[PDB]
Amino acid sequence: AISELHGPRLLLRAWRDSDREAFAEMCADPQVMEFFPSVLDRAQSDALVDRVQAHFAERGYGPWALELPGEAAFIGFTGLFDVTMDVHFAPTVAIGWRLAPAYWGRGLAREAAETALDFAFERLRLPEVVAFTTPPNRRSWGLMERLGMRRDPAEDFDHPLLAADHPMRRHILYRVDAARWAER
Ligand SMILES: CC(C)(COP(=O)(O)OP(=O)(O)OC[C@H]1O[C@@H](n2cnc3c(N)ncnc32)[C@H](O)[C@@H]1OP(=O)(O)O)[C@@H](O)C(=O)NCCC(=O)NCCS
């Protein structure tokens, strides 16, 4: 009983067991995982899918599996997740995305994110959605600003689930509120 969302090309849907093989391939891909501490093995990939499924069970939304009707069953994920960790901007709702590299450069993450944020603001009627990444991940924060999300560099933060001296600790924060989304 999970709400599926449609864009012109994409179906944002609940995860299926058949997704785990294709998602594990992505999580083992160094180009997909470049701006994360490590690639994941199958056990770690499956544990991430388990957390996504638990988010859907608890909240009725989550990082949707991305299907491309007419083309491919599974190309990655894009969607909303609740931020509960000890950061200055919590509690709030965030948006995240991970696409198989064959699908980059097609505006498919843009379309998935527009579909997810329409749901956030029209259906859930949330006041704001945030997103966060590392400065080197230019494809990721580039998508954030193209969506109309905006960054205050003063809100840069150290990720509280990484070591205080972790080389990838430094994150940047983007925000979009309901009014800014509507004004696009
Ligand atoms: C982050 C990520 C989802 C971005 O995907 P993306 O395909 O670059 O993003 P978009 O969907 O906005 O597509 C933009 C590109 O498509 C092009 N494009 C083509 N048709 C388009 C259309 N109809 N609409 C928009 N852009 C279009 C743009 O020109 C741009 O190309 P460019 O990068 O050469 O300038 C992807 O790179 C990824 O999965 N990265 C690895 C995982 C990751 O780091 N996730 C984020 C962690 S914080």
Domains for the chain: give ranges and CATH numbers: 5-183 (3.40.630.30)
Q: Is 144 annotated as a binding residue?
A: yes
**Binding site annotation covers 98?**
yes
Closest-CA residue, ligand 1 atom 27, reads 107
Q: Is the CB of 115 under 6 A from ligand 1?
A: no
Residue 133: CB within 6 Å of ligand 1?
yes
* Residue with CA closest to ligand 1 atom 21: 107
Residues 6+ apart with CB under 8 A from 113: 78, 95, 97, 143, 147
Residues in CB range of 1: below 8 A, 6 or more apart: none
From which experimental method does this structure derive? X-ray
Instruction: Specify the 3-state DSSP secondary structure of 115.
Output: helix
Contact 3, 60 (CB under 8 A): yes
Longest dimension (CA), the chain: 46
Q: What does this entry list as its resolution, in Å?
A: 1.5
Query: How far does the centroid of ligand 1 lie from the alpha carbon of residue 7, in Å?
Result: 16
**What's the CA-to-centroid distance between 140 and ligand 1, angstroms?**
8
Measured CA to CA, the distance from residue 48 to residue 177 in angstroms comes to 28
Using CB atoms within 10 Å of the CB of residue 46, give its burial: 0 to 12 exposed, 13 to 18 middle, 19+ buried.
Answer: middle
Ligand-binding site membership of 105 (annotated) = yes
